[PDB]
Amino acid sequence: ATTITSNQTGTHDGYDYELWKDSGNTSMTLNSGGAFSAQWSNIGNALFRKGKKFDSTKTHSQLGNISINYNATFNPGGNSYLCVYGWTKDPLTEYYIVDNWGTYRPTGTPKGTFTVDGGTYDIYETTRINQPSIIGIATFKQYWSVRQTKRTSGTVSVSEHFKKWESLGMPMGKMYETALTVEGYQSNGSANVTANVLTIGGKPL
Incomplete structure (x- = not known):
């Protein structure tokens, strides 16, 4: 529906969307529900x-x-x-x-x-010392759950991961965001998310 090419955050068809890049060519097409597509090249970091x-x-x-x-x-x-x-x-x-x-x-x-x-x-867990963050240059921990085998569709039990990270000494604070994301670092790619539904308490966005 609507295509953007520069940093922008908003709400589209019920879903909170965002195109972010520190630099480079980025294109994001906002589709129905949580659906969206994107392509990027000559980038620094892009989400x-x-x-x-x-x-x-x-x-x-x-x-x-x-x-x-x-x-x-x-x-x-x-x-x-x-x-x-x-x-x-x-x-x-x-x-x-x-x-x-x-x-x-x-x-x-x-x-x-x-x-x-x-x-x-x-x-995995990693620490970020004075790196860009949602609140600015700051220091913070990074939490990682990486599937041992790749896939491009399926269900992600986000809360189950959270609970497991906690049981492993990896505490969570107040939620700022949760979103199906495509990220790139000096890469040249694209993605087409044709289905993306986020439920809270089983209720879809």
């Missing part, structure tokens, strides 16, 4: 996504079970990820649940492994 931006006033347990069903087409074209992405505040945390990637598999401090949604994820 395209649709999901829910929260108010950072509630913890995930207070929001209710969070889950996403998706179907997508994805061309890494280098280092890129097809994932569920978000942040929490107090503490400031950036998280990933990666189902697909390109020439680079996300890794970090090994913390455990988790089997859910028909797959088995590797859990």
Whole structure:
């Protein structure tokens, strides 16, 4: 429906969308529901996504079970990820649940492994010292759930990952966002998310 090419956040057909890049060519087409497509090249870092931006006033347990069903087409074209992405505040945390990637598999401090949604994820934690964040240059931890085998469609039990990260000493703060996301780093690719439904307490956005 509507195509954007520069940094922009908003709400489209019920879903909170955002196109972000520090630099480079980026195109994002906003489709029905949580559907969207994107292509990028000559970029620094770029993210395209649709999901829910929260108010950072509630913890995930207070929001209710969070889950996403998706179907997508994805061309890494280098280092890129097809994932569920978000942040929490107090503490400031950036998280990933990666189902697909390109020439680079996300890794970090090994913390455990988790089997859910028909797959088995590797859990890692990494620290970010004075890096860009939703609140500006800051220091924060990164949480990672990386599927051992790639896929481009399926159900991601977001809350189950959260609960497991916590049971592993990886605390979550108030929810800032949860969204099916395509991210790229100096890669040249594209993706077409034809299906993307985020439910909260089983209720679709």
